[PDB]
Amino acid sequence: MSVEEVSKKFEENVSVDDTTATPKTVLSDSAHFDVKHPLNTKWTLWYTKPAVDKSESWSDLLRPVTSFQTVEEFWAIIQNIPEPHELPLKSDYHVFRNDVRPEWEDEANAKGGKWSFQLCGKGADIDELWLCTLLAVIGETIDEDDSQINGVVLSIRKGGNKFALWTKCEDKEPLLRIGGKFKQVLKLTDDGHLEFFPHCSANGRHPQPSITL
Amino acid sequence: GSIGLEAEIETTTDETDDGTNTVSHILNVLKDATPIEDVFSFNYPEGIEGPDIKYKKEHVKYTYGPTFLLQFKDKLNVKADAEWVQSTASKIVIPPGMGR
Ligand SMILES: C[n+]1cn([C@@H]2O[C@H](COP(=O)(O)OP(=O)(O)O)[C@@H](O)[C@H]2O)c2nc(N)[nH]c(=O)c21
Ligand SMILES: *SCC1=CC(C)(C)N(O)C1(C)C
Ligand SMILES: *SCC1=CC(C)(C)N(O)C1(C)C
Ligand SMILES: *SCC1=CC(C)(C)N(O)C1(C)C
Ligand SMILES: *SCC1=CC(C)(C)N(O)C1(C)C
C-alpha cells in the first residue's frame, strides 16, 4: 500500500476538456458564491435584543432567523461583529435545533444540561474561540464535537458576557469534560470560569443548578 | 523576433464595488449559482482549501473546519435577515456519495 508520495506521472493524467461542473466557494469567490454550502444538521439562529422586556415578552424580543444547514447564514449574523464584547450587552443569541428548538424554556427539555461561561469582560479575540467551538458544534455536529449535543446559547450582560452550551445530555460526566474545553475558550487560566445549569432548573429557574467556576 | 502584440489580456475585470459586501449582492449571486458536492467535496482555490480538515472528525459527511468557516466570515460581511429567506430558502444540500 503506497502512501503520500506521488513518485510517478501515471497516477495522474495531465489532460482535460469541457471539464463539467464548476464550484465557487465564498473564499475563492469574494463576490459570487456559485455553490451552496449544506450540512447534516438543523439549527435556527435567534438573536435577543433585551430592551423592551420591561413589559414586552422574552418571545416578543427574541429575533429568530437563519435556520439552515449552511454557513453563509449564521456567518452573516456574525458579520454584525457584535461578539461577546462588541455589541450592546444584556443581549442573547441562541442557535440550535439538531435535537430540539423551543429555547432555554424547552430546549433544556432536550439537552438537559446548560453549560454557561461567565466572563468579567475582556475584549480581545474571544469571539473567535467562543465561535470556533459553537460554529464547529453546529457545523460539525456529525461527531467528535457535537457528537449528540442539542444546541448552544449566548447571553451578554453588565459583568461582560456569558455563553451557554446545551448538550443533549449523554451524561453530565462527558459534559464536565466538554465544558473544560469551553473553559479555555473563555480565555481563562485556572480561574475555573464555567457554569452548569440543569434543565430541570433552567425552565423553573430553580435555585442551586450544578456549579459555577 | 516579434510579429504582433505579445501582450494579450484575458478577462481581467477584477473590480467590483468599493469593497462593500451587501446581502442582496451576494445572495443575488446564489440566484444563479451551482450546487455543492460538500466542503471537502470542493477545493477552494484562494490561499485556502479544506481537504481533510474536519474530515477526520469521524463520519465526516458535513464537517466544516473551524478555521474554514472563519474564512467565510471574512467574505460573509453582509448583515442579512431579509434576503436570507429569499436566498437561504435556496441553499441546496447534496449527499457526498458518487463512488459507492
Ligand atoms: C431563555 N429565556 C428566557 N426567558 C425569560 O427571561 C428570563 C431570563 O432568563 P435567563 O435566566 O437569563 O435565561 P438565559 O440566560 O438562559 O437566556 C427568564 O425568567 C424567562 O422567564 C424565556 N422565556 C421563554 N418563554 N423562553 C425562553 O427560552 C426564555
Ligand atoms: S466576572 C466575575 C464577577 C462579576 C461580578 C458580578 C462583579 N462578581 O461579583 C464576580 C466577581 C463573581
Ligand atoms: S478559533 C479561530 C482562530 C484561532 C486563533 C489561533 C486565535 N486565530 O488566529 C484564529 C482567529 C484563526
Ligand atoms: S439525560 C438522561 C438520558 C440518557 C439517555 C439514555 C441518553 N437518554 O435518552 C436520556 C436523555 C433520557
Ligand atoms: S424540573 C422538571 C420539570 C420542570 C417543568 C418544566 C416544570 N416540568 O414540567 C417538569 C416536571 C418536567
From Swiss-Prot, chain A:
There is a cross-link at K114 (Glycyl lysine isopeptide (Lys-Gly) (interchain with G-Cter in ubiquitin)). One of its GO terms (cellular component) is ribosome. Keywords: Cytoplasm, Initiation factor, Isopeptide bond, Nucleus, Phosphoprotein, Protein biosynthesis, RNA-binding, Translation regulation, Ubl conjugation. The modification Phosphothreonine is found at T22. Present with 14200 molecules/cell in log phase SD medium. Component of the eIF4F complex, which composition varies with external and internal environmental conditions. It is composed of at least eIF4A (TIF1/TIF2), eIF4E (TIF45) and eIF4G (TIF4631 or TIF4632). Interacts with PAT1 in a RNA-dependent manner. eIF4E is also known to interact with other partners. Recognizes and binds the 7-methylguanosine (m7G)-containing mRNA cap during an early step in the initiation of protein synthesis and facilitates ribosome binding by inducing the unwinding of the mRNAs secondary structures. This is Eukaryotic translation initiation factor 4E. It comes from Saccharomyces cerevisiae (strain ATCC 204508 / S288c). The gene is CDC33.
UniProtKB/Swiss-Prot annotation, chain B:
It is found in: Cytoplasm; Cytoplasm, P-body; Cytoplasm, Stress granule. It comes from the Eukaryota. Belongs to the eukaryotic initiation factor 4G family. Present with 9760 molecules/cell in log phase SD medium. Component of the eIF4F complex, which composition varies with external and internal environmental conditions. It is composed of at least eIF4A (TIF1/TIF2), eIF4E (TIF45) and eIF4G (TIF4631 or TIF4632). Interacts with PAT1 in a RNA-dependent manner. Component of the eIF4F complex, which interacts with the mRNA cap structure and serves as an initial point of assembly for the translation apparatus. Stimulates translation by interaction with polyadenylate-binding protein PAB1, bringing the 5'- and 3'-ends of the mRNA in proximity. The formation of this circular mRNP structure appears to be critical for the synergistic effects of the cap and the poly(A) tail in facilitating translation initiation, recycling of ribosomes, and mRNA stability. TIF4631 is probably essential when TIF4632 is missing. This is Eukaryotic initiation factor 4F subunit p150. It comes from Saccharomyces cerevisiae (strain ATCC 204508 / S288c) (Baker's yeast). The gene is TIF4631. The chain holds residues 389 to 488 of 952 of the full protein.
